Amino acid sequence: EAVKTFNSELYSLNDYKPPISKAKMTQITKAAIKAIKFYKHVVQSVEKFIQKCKPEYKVPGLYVIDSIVRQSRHQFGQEKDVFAPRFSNNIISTFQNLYRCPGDDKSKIVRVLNLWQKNNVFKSEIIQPLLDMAAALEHH
Amino acid sequence: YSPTSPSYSP
């Protein structure tokens, strides 16, 4: 029911042409952060969305991950945030899906990865492979 | 949304 609400905010992205408003992302985030007891289901729903959504929503879906993890780290502390560690489990697969996006949108993905590294959102054993993955795509 | 936007707090 906390999860139902989050699911409802997340999937209502399909009502909107990106760019998505700050307000909508904040709504999705608050639903996630308020559903923190069920963080595993929240991560699962975000990953499912990223797997299934149309190409135009890949960056929105990544911004959901960004927004949730950065809010959580700020609200609960970097040490204590459950979101980034749980997102880390499947994150390589998650990015494989994110990169089925319009070519014009890859620069946005790399920008978030860069910010994540600078802000130590994920430890470098996570971030660098993801960064490696972006580099490898323009080559092919 | 911007990935540099400030997080919310009291």
- List Cα–Cα distances, A75 to A103, A107, B8, in angstroms: 34, 28, 8
Instruction: Give residue for tokens 């080559």.
Output: A139
CB-CB neighbors (< 8 A) of B7 in chain A: 70-71, 73-75
Nearest by Cα to A3 from A33, A42, A29: A42
**CA A25, CA A34: separation in Å to the nearest integer?**
14
Domains, chain A, ordered by start: 1-140 (1.25.40.90)
Experimental approach taken: X-ray
**CA A118, CA A116: separation in Å to the nearest integer?**
6
Written as one letter, the residue type at A93 is S
Nearest by Cα to A129 from A84, A90, A100: A90
Contact between A19 and B1 using a beta-carbon 8 Å cutoff: yes
